[PDB]
Structure formats: C-alpha cells, structure tokens
Amino acid sequence: ISNDIAIDLGTANTLIYQKGKGIVLNEPSVVALRNKVVHAVGIEAKQMLGRTPGHMEAIRPMRDGVIADFEVAEEMIKYFIRKVHNRKGSGNPKVIVCVPSTAVERRAINDSCLNAGARRVGLIDEPMAAAIGAGLPIHEPTGSMVVDIGGGTTEVAVLSLSGIVYSRSVRVGGDKMDEAIISYMRRHHNLLIGETTAERIKKEIGTARAPGLSIDVKGRDLMQGVPREVRISEKQAADALAEPVGQIVEAVKVALEATPPELASDIADKGIMLTGGGALLRGLDAEIRDHTGLPVTVADDPLSCVALGCGKVLEH
Numbered sequence: 001i002s003n004d005i006a007i008d009l010g011t012a013n014t015l016i017y018q019k020g021k022g023i024v025l026n027e028p029s030v031v032a033l034r035n036k037v038v039h040a041v042g043i044e045a046k047q048m049l050g051r052t053p054g055h056m057e058a059i060r061p062m063r064d065g066v067i068a069d070f071e072v073a074e075e076m077i078k079y080f081i082r083k084v085h086n087r088k089g090s091g092n093p094k095v096i097v098c099v100p101s102t103a104v105e106r107r108a109i110n111d112s113c114l115n116a117g118a119r120r121v122g123l124i125d126e127p128m129a130a131a132i133g134a135g136l137p138i139h140e141p142t143g144s145m146v147v148d149i150g151g152g153t154t155e156v157a158v159l160s161l162s163g164i165v166y167s168r169s170v171r172v173g174g175d176k177m178d179e180a181i182i183s184y185m186r187r188h189h190n191l192l193i194g195e196t197t198a199e200r201i202k203k204e205i206g207t208a209r210a211p212g213l214s215i216d217v218k219g220r221d222l223m224q225g226v227p228r229e230v231r232i233s234e235k236q237a238a239d240a241l242a243e244p245v246g247q248i249v250e251a252v253k254v255a256l257e258a259t260p261p262e263l264a265s266d267i268a269d270k271g272i273m274l275t276g277g278g279a280l281l282r283g284l285d286a287e288i289r290d291h292t293g294l295p296v297t298v299a300d301d302p303l304s305c306v307a308l309g310c311g312k313v314l315e316h
Contacts, residue, residue: 003089006096006310008129009077009109011062011151011175012199012277014042015304016084017311023304024084029151031076032058041079050194064171065100065126065152067108074112081116092119096310098126100153101167124310126150127157127167130275133309134299138162143263145271147252147288148306149278151175154248156255158263166258172247174277177202184240186222189230193219202281205237208245209283245284249291256292271295275305 004019009029016025027042030049034056040048048058061073081095095118097109106123113121130148131138138144138159148155151174157167178198185191185198193201197217204215212234221228252272259267271294274285279302289296299305 001086001089003084003086003091003093004095004314005081005084005093006307006314007077007080007113008098008307008310009062010277010306011060011065011173013151013303014076014080015307016080017307017314018084018086019311019314022311023307025080026304027080029062029076030058030060031072031079032056033072038075038079041076042083047196049196063152063175065150065169066105067112070108070112074115077112078116081113081118085117093117094120094122094314096122096124096314098124098129098306098310100150101125101127101155101157101164101169122313124313125155125157125164125167126153126169126306127155128159128164129306129309129313130155130299131157131159131273131305131309132312133305133307134273134275134302136273143259143266144273145255145259145267146273146275147248147279149173149248149274149276149281149284150306151277154251154276154278156251158255158259158267160263165260165263166255168251168255170247170251172244172251174202176244176247177206177241177278177281180244181206181237181240184236185217185219185230185232188236189232190222191217191219191228191230192222193217201232201237202241205232205234206241207234207238207282208241208287210235210238241281245281245287248278248284249288252288252292256294267294271297273297273299275299275302277303 002019028046030045136144214233
C-alpha cells in the first residue's frame with residue numbers, strides 16, 4: 001500500500017492516480033477564499049464560481065496550463081494531496097505531475113508539490129502522459145500522434161520509442177471555448193452569462209460542426225442589467241466555437257507538416273488520437289479528419305487519459 005501519486009493538474013479539473021489504487025480523486029480545480037483564509041477546495045468550491053458574496057472569492061488558480069496565483073495554486077495542490085493521503089500506506093511519496101510541452105514554469109509546479117509532502121517529484125510532458133493513458137504504443141518503433149485538448153492548452157505530439165519526436169502546446173482548449181461562448185452570448189444575445197453556464201452550454205450543445213438541439217440559458221441583460229432567459233441552439237453553439245476549433249485544427253496540420261517520412265507512413269495507416277476534455281466536443285473528430293484526410297479516434301475515458309498515463313509510469 002503506497003502513497004505514491006500522479007497528478008493531472010488541469011485548469012478545470014484535477015485528477016489523482018494513486019499507486020496500487022488507480023484514480024482516487026477527480027475534482028474541480030477551484031479554491032474559495034474568505035476574508036484571506038481557504039474556505040473550500042474542489043467539489044464544494046465549483047458552484048461558488050460567479051456566486052460569492054462580499055466576503056468571499058472563488059478562483060481557478062491554473063490558467064493556460066501553468067500557475068497564475070502562486071499562493072492559491074499551492075493551497076489547492078496541498079489540499080488535494082492531503083485528501084488522498086492513506087495512513088496505511090508507505091511514506092516518502094513519489095509524485096509525478098504533468099506539464100505542458102519554460103524552466104521557470106516547470107520549477108513552479110515542481111517546488112510547489114514538494115511543499116505538500118512530496119518527497120520526490122517527477123515531471124512528465126502532458127501529451128506523452130495522454131498518449132500512454134489512451135493506450136497508444138508509445139514504446140514501439142512506430143509513430144503515434146496524440147491531440148490532448150485540455151482546459152488551458154491543446155498539446156499535439158508525435159511519439160515513438162518512449163520519446164517525443166515532435167510536440168507543440170497551443171493556448172486554445174476548453175477554457176478558450178467557454179470564453180468564446182461567453183463572448184458570443186454578449187454580442188449575439190445581449191446576455192452576460194457566467195462561466196459555469198458557459199461550460200454547461202459547451203457540454204450540452206457544443207459542437208465543432210453545424211448540424212439542431214437547443215437549451216435554455218439564463219443570465220444578466222447586457223444593457224439593462226436584469227435577469228433574462230434565452231434559447232440557444234447547436235448551430236449558434238457551432239458559430240461560437242468556430243475560431244477556437246479552427247486553431248486546434250490548424251495546430252494539428254502544423255504538426256503533420258513536421259513529421260519524418262517513415263513516421264508519416266505509420267500515421268497514414270492509423271491517424272490521430274484525441275484525448276482530454278475537448279475530445280468530447282461533438283464532431284471535433286470529424287472536423288479534424290476532414291482537414292487532414294486521416295482517421296481520427298477519440299480515446300476511451302478521454303478526461304482520464306493523462307492521469308492514467310502518469311499512473312502507468314508510477315507503477316513501473
């Protein structure tokens with residue numbers, strides 16, 4: 001019985017895999033503070049976003065894949081590590097954490113996990129972890145290509161022989177999609193919506209291609225400030241998400257351009273694997289296939305691929 005863990009420190013959700021147990025924590029990456037004292041972290045903090053009274057704030061301390069407010073991020077990490085501690089398990093915890101594909105950035109997560117009891121910290125590139133967790137043959141002399149559409153970044157990589165052949169991190173992912181939905185509601189519906197509503201829209205009717213289905217969305221009228229409800233459809237959702245989807249599609253194309261001939265041949269036969277919260281975006285697989293001519297597969301349990309991948313390393 002071990003306290004070794006692997007952490008996917010996502011901008012929207014944090015998952016922890018514990019050696020010998022598997023995924024033991026999956027919670028929103030949100031911290032609420034009361035005036036500053038930590039009021040709540042994770043599951044109970046998420047619904048506080050956009051809803052805090054005067055004495056309180058609710059913060060997503062990770063943004064674009066790295067750390068924004070250092071103090072709050074550190075409290076978030078310490079909270080989750082403490083929550084999964086097993087007093088029946090061995091000590092000297094080894095912690096693996098993923099990082100997007102700067103030395104400054106790597107150091108921050110590294111030193112940051114040491115403060116919670118991590119005895120030793122190992123860093124893994126996020127797309128490598130995603131690929132391992134999606135079940136790609138990353139150890140073989142064969143090209144595999146992964147696209148991990150995380151909250152803060154989309155990581156595109158070509159893997160072979162336990163290493164990275166090509167990798168790139170683009171700052172477009174789930175957070176940018178939500179923000180595009182928010183901006184769209186403002187311009188097209190004169191409606192100011194919160195982030196939690198934006199995420200609901202993305203999950204319920206988000207699509208990478210025009211179809212459709214509709215849902216009822218509420219918020220604050222743009223000019224007159226009062227509560228209001230509007231109907232939005234998949235077609236509108238598609239228009240909202242077009243720009244960030246195109247940025248994702250374009251990064252994939254750029255990565256393909258960089259692929260060596262023999263690896264290109266391996267990728268021609270099997271295509272691209274999508275992981276991460278964005279992999280669930282309806283039609284994104286079709287959209288990428290249309291622009292590349294390659295098969296596109298959505299991973300099993302795509303939200304968990306990174307944590308499961310780091311978890312595999314942790315067990316070996």
